[PDB]
Design a protein around this ligand. Structure first.
Ligand SMILES: CC(C)[C@@H](C)/C=C/[C@@H](C)[C@H]1CC[C@H]2C3=CC=C4C[C@@H](O)CC[C@]4(C)[C@H]3CC[C@]12C
Length: 160
């Protein structure tokens, strides 16, 4: 469930918001392009605190499909204008075994830190809409790669 409990971003809350979710989508597009993905759509601005992002993810697993599409729903859930905000991703990947029976939900918690730093926690969980003996492989499939995805995102986020 709890991917990363406390990373610290040496940049203010409002700028981390702008850098990952601002109306200039070029940073997040570079971020997303760096996580083993291709055929990335043109990254939309948020409208009504929601935006859709599509791409194909290359997989190196035991023997999944070894690539799958991803239809990602990204929404800004909570905005306390000074102390914290939170973004929630719902990620569908129809091409994998038992796709359309689940989605991956990841919450990105960003909070005002000391001398106006930003610390983030990342929490995910699979929501199920169908039975599947694969349940516990997908569940730890989601957690495992999300762990990797967060590592690249904070790795690229600090560089700038
Ligand atoms: C045996 C097979 C069927 C197993 C391994 C399939 C695992 C899939 C479902 C996993 C592996 C990589 C995972 C994956 C990696 C990284 C991210 C980035 C994150 O920001 C949203 C979720 C997302 C997109 C997830 C979704 C679920 C994926 C695509």
């Amino acid at each position: 469930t709890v991917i990363d409990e406390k990373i610290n971003i040496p940049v203010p809350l409002g700028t981390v918001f702008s850098l990952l979710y601002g109306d200039d989508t070029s940073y997040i597009k570079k971020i997303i392009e760096n996580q083993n993905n291709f055929n990335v759509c043109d990254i939309p601005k948020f409208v009504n605190n929601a935006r859709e992002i599509t791409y194909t993810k290359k997989l190196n697993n035991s023997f999944g499909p070894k690539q799958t599409k991803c239809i990602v729903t990204e929404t800004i859930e909570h905005m306390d204008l000074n102390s914290f905000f939170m973004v929630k991703q719902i990620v569908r990947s129809p091409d994998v075994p038992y796709g359309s029976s689940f989605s991956v939900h990841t919450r990105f918690f960003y909070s005002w830190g000391d001398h106006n730093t930003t610390n983030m926690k990342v929490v995910t969980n699979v929501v199920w809409t169908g039975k599947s003996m694969l349940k516990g492989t997908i569940e730890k499939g989601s957690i495992d790669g999300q762990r990797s995805s967060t590592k690249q995102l904070v790795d690229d986020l600090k560089k700038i």
